[PDB]
Every structure is written in structure tokens, then in C-alpha cells.
Design a protein around this ligand. Structure first.
Ligand code: NAP
Ligand code: NAP
Lengths: 414, 414
């Protein structure tokens, strides 16, 4: 167009292996040509994390907390093999954990939808954002074995020196067993609620909290009550304003309704075992290359976007041998659009906001037009039947998006 | 032909609405013309359960425990609307719960496969039986709310006065929240394992056991260990003889593995509830009318079979107005075959065993020949594209299976 859009302040974290390659391609072909940013970029590549003794990771989280918008590229989480591969000098903790443990918030995973790409439920036309309440990786489980008869109890001792309360979870009369301890601070539940409500107002969809309060009448009921409270004291007004609404459901009714729904709703959910933050998601159904992720902070201001997958090592290896690759960039691309979309919102930057949207529509439109990477072509035909003529390589795809983006932005000039 | 197959003692449970109708059809058109049974019939119809203050439900459970074979028709779980519709004098509990509660066991959900009916994975050609740990009974976690700052610790107090052990669940410093303790006796794990290993032998496929032994190194470790103990010590041999095996996994991996599989295997889940993935979808994708359910007890003798779906009220309603309906009877039919097949096994009744399998083949063969109910067809062409000539009535279909069962059994004697 004319002058690049003044995007504002954004925090960018560079990553590793395959994602680092496509990441640079995204900035070079889809972001920089149209937006000027006051970039606070930190190199979270493994060699740099090692070199700075992981100091860069903290600095990145610090930066996000302060500039509110963070976009992250996938990073290698060291294990024995990695320690050996790069001669690391210590097994560095996952940077995703370090970041999440400093900013707090709830992660919401979404799978971009395309009409010509199969969904678990054909009827799903609009996406389904899902945020699971989970402790960070800094959480340590409290489970033991119990070898033989005896009683197991759970106890609460007020710190003000008042009557101690004991409960008796189970008395093992014969044989042994196994037992767990679990907890949740009200604050965490509030945060969970806040991040959930906001998320729904930004997207413009109805929120649904699923719990199993029928069984955990006090545990889960706690979530239910705290949601309603926060929903009435604040939010409800805006939900009605935006034609949206909040509402509770028993995990059993959700999974059923969800199966008969067309989609388009925020699904916050508390599971029996609870969950713990992890880097990976779970292959499952649908291409990981289409799985977005967003760490939404309680304050309504801070947000960190990233793809749901990892660095895609296998793909990288081939790229390292000069082999042709076909890595999906949608998930990474959406990390940028969601970040810029949030940015534009905090600053009432109409232009940037339009840009953010445009890039997503072009991403989706490009695929629905028949242009896609191998992973998607395989969702349509199945690995065995997929031919090369069925897809584009990593670079050809990036090139197609950029072309279509150029067309999209020109057409909007009217 | 002449003399009918002499089946043995089978406990039957009549149900409600639409299923009650297809249930009698199955009996008149598919079972009674070829098999004489020593029937212990219990009317679990909503009106009758109400008239007997639910004593019929308990007598049926008592009867199943006695004759080891029970087939069941879908039943109505009363809710407020149901209470008002039948002027119930109490909101009766799920007869399914009362029965599993009395019998104990592990429910196995298996979807019947048909070559011309789309599946989740074009690769799955063999069934994927999913069984979940049936806590039910009076088991329950001990949850409570934490008023304010204080410590919450779980304690194990040995019977042999041995060293008492204390674990800290969490120290509420901000004060406020919720906490809880969970437990599990070795026996439950054992029964679970027994039902699993057995179920993998009845069918002829390997058996996996998914777990999160990485997060809950003690709790889940117990399942892994106990499943192996009981395996080596009681099933290793038998599995070998059938060229079958057993291994442990990780939920994350299992779900992937299944996707990239051809099917044919038993999957035992320790997992709780469902979420954003193919749980209830893996066991039964598409139509609920092909979803079977089997309760297997530890004793390897008792079994309760029933369709996974419900009474199909929507169809029953149409039927009441004299509107044509197309209700899939496949699930209901397999509840009868699995049951009779088990009767046959327990009594070395080669004729009955022949009949059971014979009836299943006819069902599947009939659908693969293009004769099916509207739920299917919809799976093929999609609701919008289904035309009347694409499927059959609840009746026209039961009729088609009748003529086909006759041939099948006729040409068998020769
Ligand atoms: N920074 C993060 O958020 C994050 C998250 C998870 C993992 N990781 C890191 O990644 C490394 C291990 O990687 P991983 O094996 O778990 O990989 P991954 O990136 O999660 O994906 C594993 C497989 O998913 C498919 N896939 C994922 N993204 C794809 C895309 N964009 N396009 C096409 N196919 C895609 C590929 O299947 P095919 O091979 O069948 O094509 C690939 O082999 C570790 O160093 C780990 O710490 C980082
Ligand atoms: N006894 C049990 O195991 C059990 C289990 C679940 C529910 N229920 C009871 O069923 C009643 C409510 O029923 P629900 O709404 O949950 O119904 P449902 O029987 O579970 O099925 C709901 C929908 O599934 C489809 N469907 C299910 N079985 C089908 C079949 N055999 N052939 C064709 N389509 C089939 C129909 O879709 P279309 O409407 O799109 O055709 C039907 O409306 C309650 O009284 C509830 O307690 C009993």
C-alpha cells in the first residue's frame, strides 16, 4: 500500500528448528511489508538460552508483562538428548513454563476451521476455543501408594490457630491401594473466570463453564459459584450488550451439546484430575499445524500468542539435508495476527485491526481455494493417496499467501 | 424350520419409548422364531418402575447376578420434566446405575463397523473397544472448601501401628479455596485388569492400557504395575496362544497411535470424563445407532449388554403422531447377540453360538448391501443429500433383516 501501518509496541520471541525458518518467512513476507513495529525481540533459540544462561527467557516474560503483547515461536525444551545435541551446560526448564509462571493466565487452544478440511464433527462451522484450568509445570503431584490396612485422611489447619478439621478419605480395612491430594486457591479460580470472560468478549461468543459439580459438590461447585459471582458483579452487562451470555454445564451435557452444536463458543473446563501446563498438545484428530494457542491474562491487558505445536524437528531434519519440506504456517501466522489484533485493540488501531483480520481470512481462503501444505492435503485424501500435485512446499505456500494478501489489501482500498 | 434352538436362561429388561418398540420387533422378527429361551423378563418401563417404587429394577439386577446373562432395552432416566410428564412420585435414579452398582464391572463400548459407512479414520477397518474404570458404587472423593489461610495435608495411618506418614497438599497463604482427597483400592484395579484381559481374549485382539503415570507417578503407576502383575501371572500364556499381546502407554501417545491405526484392539482407559478429543467419538463416530455397550464383571461369568444410545424420544414422538420413522436397531440387536453369544459360551451351546454370530453377519451384510436406516446414508451422503429412496423405515428395515436372517439360517443347515 502507501505507508506501512504503525503497529505499535510488540514483543517477539524467536524460536528453533523448523518454526524458526517459517517464522522469519512470516515476518519477511507477511508482517514487515505492511506493518512497522516498535519490536522488543528476544532470541529464545536454544544456543542463545544456553549462552545467556536462560536470562533471555526471563527478560522476554518481563517484556511481555510490560508491553502486554507477546508473540512466541516454538522453542526446544531440553532433555538428555538435547543436552547432548547442543552440549548444553544444564538442562534448561521449558521457556513456555518460565513465561507462563511469570505472567499467569489461562491457555486457550483453538483449531482454525476450513470448509474443505474435515472436522471431528462435520457440523462444526465456527471454531471452539477451549481453555483448561491447569497448574503450571512448577506444580508437584501429591500422590502416594498405601501398602496395606490403615486409614487415609485429609486435614486442614487454620493458620490462626483455630479448630483443626479432619476428613477421612478412606479406611483401607483389607489390602492396599493408592491416594491423591488436590487443591485450588480461590484466586486461581477467579483468574480462570476473569480470563475466560474477557476471552469471550474479545471473540464475541457465549461462554460455557463445564464442571462435574454433581459429584464434587463442594470442589467444582466452588468454580461454579465464583464464576456466577464474577459474572454478575462484572461482565454480564457487556455479554448482554454483545448479545452474548454465560452459562454453566455438567461435563456430560457439554460433550453432548458440543457434538450437536455448529460451534462458535468459549469452553472453559475444569477436569476431575485437573491438568498441568505442558508444551505439547496431543496429536489427536486434525493437523497440529492448525492449532492456535493464547495465554490470556486475568488483567484483560496481557496476552501471549503461539502455535500449539512444537519446532517440528522431523521436518527440520529434512530441511537440513536440502530435502523439500511442507510445513504448515497457519498456527504460527495466527500467533502474529492474534498478537497484533490484541495490540490494535489496546490502542484502538483500526488499521492494524483490519490488517490482523485480513491476514487470517487470506490464510483460510487460500486453503479453501485448494492451496495447502502436505499435512492438510492428507486430511482430505489420507497419506497413502496424497500426491505431490496435491500440495505446495513450505516456500510455495508462503508465496501464495503473500500474493493473496497483496490482492486482499488492494481490494480493501475501496 | 422345525425345532428351535434351545437357548438357556437369559435375563431380559424391557424399556421405554422408541427402543421399546424396536425391542419387541427384534424379539418377534429376529429371536423368537428361532430360539426358545428360559426368559426372566423384567419390565423396566418408566411407568412400571414407578408402580413398583423401582423394585423391578433391583430384582432385575438380582436376576442378572444369578443367571449371568442380561440384555437390556434403553430406559428413561427421570428428570424434572419426566417427573411432570409421568407424574412420578419420586425422581428415580438411572436403572443403569442401580444395576452396575449391584453387579460391579467394566463397561466396554464398541462401534459396529460397515465397509460402506464412513468412519473417523478411513483406516479403521477393525473395531476399537474402549473400556473405562467403573468407580460408581459408593466410591467418592472427599472434597471440602478451605475457609482461609492454613495447611492441607493427607495422612496415612497404618493398622500395624507402623510409621505414620504425612504429605502436604498445599499451604494456603493467600488463604481461601477448595481441596480434596481421592482414593482407590487395589481390588478395583485388579477387577479392571481382569475384565480387560478377558475381554481381549473373547475377541482376538491386543489390549493397551493408557495412563498419565508421568504426572501421577504413584497413583497411575499402580495401574501399570497391577495390570502387568496380573498379566504375566495370569494371562501372558493365553495371549501368546492367540498371537495376542499387552502393553502400557501414555494417553497422549495412545490417542495418536489409534489415529494412525487400522483398529482391532481393546483400549482400557483410567482417564476421567471427556474433553477436546475423540473419546466418545473414537468408540462410536457418526451414528449412535451402531454403538454397543457391554458390562463385564470380574468373575468372567456375568455380563450385561445394551445399546449405548438412549430411547430416541424424538423418533418416538413422531411415531405417536403416525409419522414415518427410521430408527437404527443395530445397537439393540447386538445387545441380544452379545448376550446370546455369552449364553452359548457359558453353556457350550454350538447352535446358539452359531445363531448369535449368524445374526450379526446378517445385520452388517444387510447394511453393506445398501439397505439401511436414515441415520446411516446420512453418514454417507449428508442429511441435505439424503432422498427417500436412500434408506428404509424402522419397519422396512426390520423386515429386510428378517428376510435376510431367514435365508442365512436356511442355507446354513444345508
Ligand atoms: N515451544 C513450544 O511451544 C513447543 C511445544 C511442543 C514441543 N516443542 C519442542 O519440540 C521438540 C519435539 O518436537 P515434537 O516431536 O514434539 O514436534 P511437534 O512440533 O509438536 O509435531 C510433531 C509432529 O506433528 C506434525 N506437525 C507439527 N506441526 C506441524 C506443522 N506446522 N506442519 C505439518 N506437520 C506438523 C508433524 O507430523 P509428520 O512428522 O507426520 O509430518 C511432526 O513430526 C522438543 O524440543 C520440544 O521441546 C516446543
Ligand atoms: N438407557 C440408556 O442407556 C440411555 C442412554 C442415554 C439417554 N437415555 C434416555 O433417553 C431419553 C432422552 O433421549 P436422548 O435425547 O438422550 O436420546 P438418544 O436416544 O440418546 O439419541 C438422541 C439422538 O440420537 C440419534 N439416535 C440415537 N439412537 C438412534 C438410533 N437408534 N437410530 C437413529 N438415530 C438415533 C437421534 O438423532 P436425530 O434426532 O438427529 O435422529 C436422537 O434424537 C431420556 O429419558 C434419557 O434418560 C437412556
Amino acid at each position: 500500500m502507501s505507508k506501512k501501518i504503525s503497529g505499535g509496541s510488540v514483543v517477539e520471541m524467536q524460536g528453533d528448528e523448523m518454526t524458526r525458518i517459517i517464522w522469519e518467512l512470516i515476518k519477511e513476507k507477511l508482517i514487515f511489508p505492511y506493518v512497522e513495529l516498535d519490536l522488543h525481540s528476544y532470541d529464545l533459540g536454544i544456543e542463545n538460552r544456553d549462552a545467556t544462561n536462560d536470562q533471555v527467557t526471563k527478560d522476554a516474560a518481563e517484556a511481555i508483562k510490560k508491553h502486554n503483547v507477546g508473540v512466541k515461536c516454538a522453542t526446544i525444551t531440553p532433555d538428555e538428548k538435547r543436552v547432548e545435541e547442543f552440549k548444553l551446560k544444564q538442562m534448561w526448564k521449558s521457556p513456555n513454563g518460565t513465561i507462563r509462571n511469570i505472567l499467569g493466565g489461562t491457555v486457550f487452544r483453538e483449531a482454525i476451521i476450513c470448509k474443505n478440511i474435515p472436522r471431528l464433527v462435520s457440523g462444526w462451522v465456527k471454531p471452539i476455543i477451549i481453555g483448561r484450568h491447569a497448574y503450571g509445570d512448577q506444580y508437584r503431584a501429591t500422590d502416594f501408594v498405601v501398602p496395606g490396612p490403615g486409614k487415609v485422611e485429609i486435614t486442614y489447619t487454620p493458620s490462626d490457630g483455630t479448630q483443626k478439621v479432619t476428613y477421612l478419605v478412606h479406611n483401607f480395612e483389607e489390602g492396599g491401594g493408592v491416594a491423591m491430594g488436590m487443591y485450588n486457591q480461590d484466586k486461581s479460580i477467579e483468574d480462570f473466570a476473569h480470563s475466560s470472560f474477557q476471552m469471550a468478549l474479545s471473540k464475541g461468543w457465549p461462554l460455557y463453564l463445564s464442571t462435574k459439580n454433581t459429584i464434587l459438590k463442594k470442589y467444582d461447585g466452588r468454580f461454579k459459584d465464583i464464576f456466577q459471582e464474577i459474572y454478575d458483579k462484572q461482565y454480564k452487562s457487556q455479554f448482554e450488550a454483545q448479545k452474548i451470555w454465560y452459562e454453566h454445564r455438567l461435563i456430560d451435557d457439554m460433550v453432548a451439546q458440543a457434538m450437536k452444536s455448529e460451534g462458535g463458543f468459549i469452553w472453559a473446563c475444569k477436569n476431575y484430575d485437573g491438568d498441568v501446563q505442558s508444551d505439547s498438545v496431543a496429536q489427536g484428530y486434525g493437523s497440529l499445524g492448525m492449532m492456535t494457542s493464547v495465554l490470556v491474562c486475568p488483567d484483560g491487558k496481557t496476552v501471549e500468542a503461539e502455535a500449539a505445536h512444537g519446532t517440528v524437528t522431523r521436518h527440520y531434519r529434512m530441511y537440513q539435508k536440502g530435502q523439500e519440506t511442507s510445513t504448515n504456517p497457519i498456527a504460527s501466522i495466527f500467533a502474529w495476527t492474534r498478537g497484533l489484533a490484541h495490540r490494535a485493540k489496546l490502542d484502538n488501531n483500526k488499521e492494524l485491526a483490519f490488517f490482523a483480520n485480513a491476514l487470517e481470512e487470506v490464510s483460510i481462503e487460500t486453503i479453501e481455494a485448494g492451496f495447502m501444505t502436505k499435512d492438510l492435503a492428507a486430511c482430505i485424501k489420507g497419506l497413502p493417496n496424497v500426491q505431490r500435485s496435491d500440495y505446495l512446499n513450505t516456500f510455495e505456500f508462503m508465496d501464495k499467501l503473500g500474493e493473496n494478501l497483496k490482492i486482499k489489501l488492494a481490494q480493501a482500498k475501496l
